[PDB]
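Dear colleague,

Following up on Tuesday's group meeting, I ran the structure prediction for the three-component complex that the binding team flagged. I've pasted the input sequences exactly as they went in, so you can double-check that nothing got truncated or mislabelled along the way. The structure tokens for the whole assembly follow below. Feel free to forward this to whoever is handling the docking comparison.

Inputs:
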Amino acid sequence: RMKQIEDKIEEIESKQKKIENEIARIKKLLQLTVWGIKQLQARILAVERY
Amino acid sequence: MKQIEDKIEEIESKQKKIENEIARIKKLLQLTVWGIKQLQARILAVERY
Amino acid sequence: RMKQIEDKIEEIESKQKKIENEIARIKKLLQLTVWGIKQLQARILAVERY
């Protein structure tokens, strides 16, 4: 009984580490999309006014 | 022993909910990137005209 | 070994709560980027219509 409790916990820990990695990648990409939107906003405002 | 099985089942259920939310976040982020690149191409067309 | 299991379970629950809070912040920012993209599309369309 002790062994397969330890097995399930090890599996959960592994999924948790994968979740943290996926979140870190999501944060980096979301950071680039926000910056990209700001760059587009500057170009369209330039087109509107000039 | 019983309180551990309950906690493991609860954790597993929480992990699945997080995986599902992450999958939707990834789906939406892919479409936002795709949309941002399309807008970039449209603004460049106006700039070059 | 049982105490190790209890600690790891508690560690996982706490990390899961931190992940949920981070996901909640990610959703808010993602909601803001979608709104910003829609506003940019209308502005680009406004110039294109000329």
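The interface with chain B takes residues 5-6, 9, 12-13, 16, 19-20, 23, 26-27, 30, 33-34, 37, 40-41, 44, 47-48 of chain C (CB under 8 Å).

Cheers,
M.
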